[PDB]
Ligand binder design. Structure first.
Ligand code: NKW
Ligand code: NKW
Ligand code: CL
Ligand code: CL
Ligand code: CL
Ligand code: NA
Length: 333
């Protein structure tokens, strides 16, 4: 028999109850703007599918960020545009301002409202205990929002979190790998960066959901509270699961494989071995102990589960005791 089917525990049917047009991004008609409204100021960085620039809107002298959509299928372009339009105005989600094409090269570009080019990876190994809780809560607002809107990000990692630490403001960026969640859909498992890939991607379980983002978030949290970058440091996608298995243990891994009737790639048979589930205390030392609390470990434990169904949802995560002081201070402000 094949793999056992899976459904998201939350927001399962939200796209089914929308109009077709909400999620049928292949049918979306983009009104392409004029590239000449903007002047590029400077390169901010060059990614995999994108070059990103600081630019000026020469109509209002407003600073913007421009992402030139490096050669890729039109299908992927429409998907990213439609997701950005659907999520526009959501909490801590980057704001799409315009969509333009080069009159010559015909190359699409996305224009975003300005954010400083300071990503979370530059700051997240130097935060106080309170600021880790604060910024994790801000990321959870973006994830509960996009999940509630029927969208999984699929590339949650520190390089995709822009922070203005001065203004205590955060935006979740790079929606290029994001997808709409549809119950029973089998997704590409070649998404996310190696260190943030959930076990579902590593064992090739395709019927995954929003809970993939919650694994990635757990990898970020573990990195920050233990000052260990990355937390799960695999050589390649096979060794990545071994690094996880040495922490979470093999018993829960094989129970997860049995539960979903997953056919494990033969390469895994000699490399996973047999490992106890490690107590989180093993990762605590004199230079991280100020970031580690019972509350932090209880929360982390509930994100980092093999079984995607077991993991906290974004809204359940926001209700965890780890965030009580953040929630109280927000209500006061
Ligand atoms: Br938006 C934008 C503005 C000017 C540009 N020059 N090359 N590519 C561009 C994209
Ligand atoms: Br603003 C901004 C900066 C970089 C980005 N990469 N993808 N989306 C982005 C938005
Ligand atoms: Cl990163
Ligand atoms: Cl490791
Ligand atoms: Cl132990
Ligand atoms: Na401590």
């Amino acid at each position: 028999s094949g793999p056992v089917p899976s459904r998201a525990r939350v927001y399962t049917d939200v796209n089914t109850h929308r109009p077709r047009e909400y999620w049928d991004y292949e049918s979306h008609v983009v009104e392409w703007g004029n590239q000449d409204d903007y002047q590029l100021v400077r390169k901010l960085g060059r990614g995999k599918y994108s070059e990103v620039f600081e630019a000026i809107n020469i109509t209002n002298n407003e600073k913007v960020v421009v992402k030139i959509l490096k050669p890729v299928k039109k299908k992927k372009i429409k998907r990213e545009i439609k997701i950005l339009e659907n999520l526009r105005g959501g909490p801590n989600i980057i704001t799409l301002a315009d969509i333009v094409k080069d009159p010559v090269s015909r190359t699409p570009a996305l224009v975003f409202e300005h954010v400083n080019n300071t990503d979370f990876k530059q700051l997240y190994q130097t935060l106080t205990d309170y600021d880790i809780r604060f910024y994790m809560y801000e990321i959870l607002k973006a994830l509960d929002y996009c999940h509630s809107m029927g969208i999984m990000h699929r590339d949650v990692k520190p390089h995709n979190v822009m922070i203005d630490h001065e203004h205590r403001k955060l935006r979740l960026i790079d929606w290029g790998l994001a997808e709409f969640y549809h119950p029973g859909q089998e997704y590409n498992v070649r998404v996310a960066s190696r260190y943030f890939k959930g076990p579902e991607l590593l064992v090739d379980y395709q019927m995954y959901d929003y809970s993939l983002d919650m694994w990635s978030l757990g990898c970020m949290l573990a990195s920050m509270i233990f000052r260990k970058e990355p937390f799960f440091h695999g050589h390649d996608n096979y060794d990545q699961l071994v690094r996880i298995a040495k922490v979470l243990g093999t018993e829960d891994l094989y129970d997860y494989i049995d539960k979903y009737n997953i056919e494990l790639d033969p390469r895994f048979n000699d490399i996973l071995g047999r490992h106890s589930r490690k107590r989180w205390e093993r990762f605590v030392h004199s230079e991280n102990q100020h970031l580690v609390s019972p509350e932090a470990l209880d929360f982390l434990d509930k994100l980092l589960r093999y079984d995607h169904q077991s993991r906290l949802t974004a809204r359940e995560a926001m209700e965890h005791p780890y965030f009580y002081t953040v929630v109280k201070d927000q209500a006061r402000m």
